[PDB]
């Protein structure tokens, strides 16, 4: 690849659209070139939650699927930094939704969205409905967190989207089992029906 630019990456993160545009108009920077930590302009724009910049960079046909050294794409940055407007735009542009977000548990993009933003969780499932049942590194899906700590309405949401109650985590437990362990009688009753 060609030259990367610290000034561009910083302007993208900080949200300075005029500066991004002035730097890109020179056609001297390879917009897909990765810096020393694997970061691109798009990852910086997404991490900083800068929709206008992200839209501009998408108009230049940047690669959506480059990963930084932590293994995250621009979409994972958007979701983990609560930039759900950016996440939506990236999903629309065809960004891969079947990815893992950074952290010890290896949660799926879907699991992180399901905890934080229902609309993005639905956008993800519209792309690949089987992600509802894709487990993290402990063998748990989104249903397990709700079984422990959530409410019967949350159980209903995930079951309506196809959550499979029979799935077992790496300890051999179902969502019903973890509800019972957590003394969550309401979710246990909802899972039992």
Automatic annotation (TrEMBL):
Top-rank lineage group of the source organism: Bacteria
UniProt key word Nucleus: no
Keywords: ANK repeat, Repeat, Signal
Pfam families per record: Ank_2
Cited InterPro entries: Ankyrin_rpt, Ankyrin_rpt-contain_sf
ANK repeats: 37-69, 70-102, 138-170
Keyword Signal: yes
Xref: Gene3D superfamilies: Ankyrin repeat-containing domain
Alphabetized SMART domains for the sequence: ANK
PANTHER family hit by this protein: ANKYRIN REPEAT DOMAIN-CONTAINING PROTEIN 39-RELATED (PTHR24171)
Name under which the protein is recorded: Uncharacterized protein
Originating species: Bdellovibrio bacteriovorus (strain ATCC 15356 / DSM 50701 / NCIMB 9529 / HD100)
Taxonomic placement: Bacteria, Pseudomonadati, Bdellovibrionota, Bdellovibrionia, Bdellovibrionales
